[PDB]
Amino acid sequence: THTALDRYMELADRAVRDPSALAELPTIFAPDATVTLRDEPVTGMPAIMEFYRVFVAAVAESKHYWTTTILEDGTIESHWVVAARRADGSLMTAAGVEHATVDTDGLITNLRNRYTRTPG
Amino acid sequence: THTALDRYMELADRAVRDPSALAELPTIFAPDATVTLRDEPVTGMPAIMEFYRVFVAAVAESKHYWTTTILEDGTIESHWVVAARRADGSLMTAAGVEHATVDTDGLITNLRNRYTRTPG
Numbered sequence: 001t002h003t004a005l006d007r008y009m010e011l012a013d014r015a016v017r018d019p020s021a022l023a024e025l026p027t028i029f030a031p032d033a034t035v036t037l038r039d040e041p042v043t044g045m046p047a048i049m050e051f052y053r054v055f056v057a058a059v060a061e062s063k064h065y066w067t068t069t070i071l072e073d074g075t076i077e078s079h080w081v082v083a084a085r086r087a088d089g090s091l092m093t094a095a096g097v098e099h100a101t102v103d104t105d106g107l108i109t110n111l112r113n114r115y116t117r118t119p120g
Numbered sequence: 121t122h123t124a125l126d127r128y129m130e131l132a133d134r135a136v137r138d139p140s141a142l143a144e145l146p147t148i149f150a151p152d153a154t155v156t157l158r159d160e161p162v163t164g165m166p167a168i169m170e171f172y173r174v175f176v177a178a179v180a181e182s183k184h185y186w187t188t189t190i191l192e193d194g195t196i197e198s199h200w201v202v203a204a205r206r207a208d209g210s211l212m213t214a215a216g217v218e219h220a221t222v223d224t225d226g227l228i229t230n231l232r233n234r235y236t237r238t239p240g
Contacts, residue, residue, distance in 0.1 A: 063183035
């Protein structure tokens with residue numbers, strides 16, 4: 001599928017290679033969206049773009065796989081996994097579930113992640 | 121680096137995309153090699169090729185990252201991570217350390233893996 005959460009997942013790996021791809025964020029998230037990947041929310045396009053710039057700076061190479069469903073209530077859910085080499089040379093994996101609220105255009109207003117395998 | 125264990129790691133993902141690439145196995149392992157990925161050993165090129173055919177058959181897409189060192193005694197060690205979509209559609213990650221003995225040609229005579237993050 002090709003929901004905004006799918007585009008979000010595709011962008012994660014592309015932005016690692018090419019950080020300037022993060023200019024696509026306003027085609028994925030609404031203005032004034034709020035994102036919480038772990039513990040802290042980040043709200044609005046300027047904060048979101050900087051959070052992801054700093055996120056992708058810390059990664060040398062990554063690959064994500066994911067499966068996406070649209071729930072009962074219109075919420076989108078993507079189970080995902082990643083493997084990566086971090087910019088410090090360490091290797092990592094993680095897995096979790098992302099839950100997005102979308103608006104009428106289909107752009108993400110609220111993104112929250114829960115880890116099922118913490119980054120490690 | 122480009123040791124035999126590096127070539128093994130590279131083949132892991134390529135063979136998922138193109139199983140015919142497992143014909144490269146005799147450029148990586150000596151004949152009569154023994155491999156133990158988890159619990160039970162598999163010995164000799166014919167058993168090794170079949171083990172890996174069955175292995176890659178169970179995987180739809182994967183990516184590995186790894187770092188390789190040559191140890192004091194000349195055994196090779198690669199820390200590695202993987203994320204994958206299995207052939208049953210499930211997602212997984214895993215991580216571990218592979219230790220290879222090599223012969224004077226540099227081909228692997230004995231490969232053993234220990235998981236630091238079990239497949240799941």
